[PDB]
Amino acid sequence: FSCNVDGGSSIGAGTTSVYVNLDPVIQPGQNLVVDLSQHISCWNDYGGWYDTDHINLVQGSAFAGSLQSYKGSLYWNNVTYPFPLTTNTNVLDIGDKTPMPLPLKLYITPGGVVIKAGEVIARIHMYKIATLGSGNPRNFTWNIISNNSVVMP
């Protein structure tokens, strides 16, 4: 099982920065959408659903810093969850060699500075376990970083 970010080199475990470009100016009350499907993809090395991998996001994943006071929601694989996660998300099955964009979106409800450029705005813990044997479990952490500032007028 492997993942990559923006077509980068394969990732087997660990913490990885995921850089996003956001609307730099948002109005009061309007929600910020952070689409992550366009940035992170994962795949099964076998294919044919042989040793299918089970993937979920993990309880405790939350905003960082900063947006700790912010409330929001997280979309994962046909279910939306309050964010920060107080439970695990549902499990996504990956058993094809075809890279699968993570079905993942982050929704953020906000002086005028909402997001600071270059800061970690969310820490998303992802868990992997395979079907074969003990499962070879692996932990991933995606540190979501905005390339640009987002402000309110």
Beta bridge partners of 140: 14, 126
> What method was applied to determine this entry?
X-ray
Question: Who contacts 128 (Cβ-Cβ below 8 Å, separation ≥6)?
Answer: 1, 53, 54, 55, 137, 138, 139, 140
Task: Note down the domain range covering 131.
Answer: 1-153
CA within 13 Å, CB half, 32: 26
For the beta carbon of residue 108, count every other beta carbon within 10 angstroms: 22
Exposed, middle or buried, 54 (CB in 10 Å: 0-12/13-18/19+)? middle
Are the C-beta atoms of residues 128 and 58 closer than 8 Å to each other? Answer: no
Q: Is the peptide bond before 37 cis (omega within 30 degrees of 0)?
A: no
CATH of the domain at 48: 2.60.40.1090
Beta bridge partners of 13: none
Q: How many angstroms separate the Cα of 90 from the Cα of each of 74, 104, 111?
A: 12, 12, 37
Taking the C-alpha atoms of residue 94 and residue 76, their distance in angstroms, rounded to an integer, is: 14
Number of domains into which the chain is organized: 1
CA within 13 Å, CB half, 2: 13
Q: Would you state the structure tokens that stand for residue 37, as one six-digit string?
A: 């499907």
Q: What is the CA radius of gyration of the chain?
A: 16
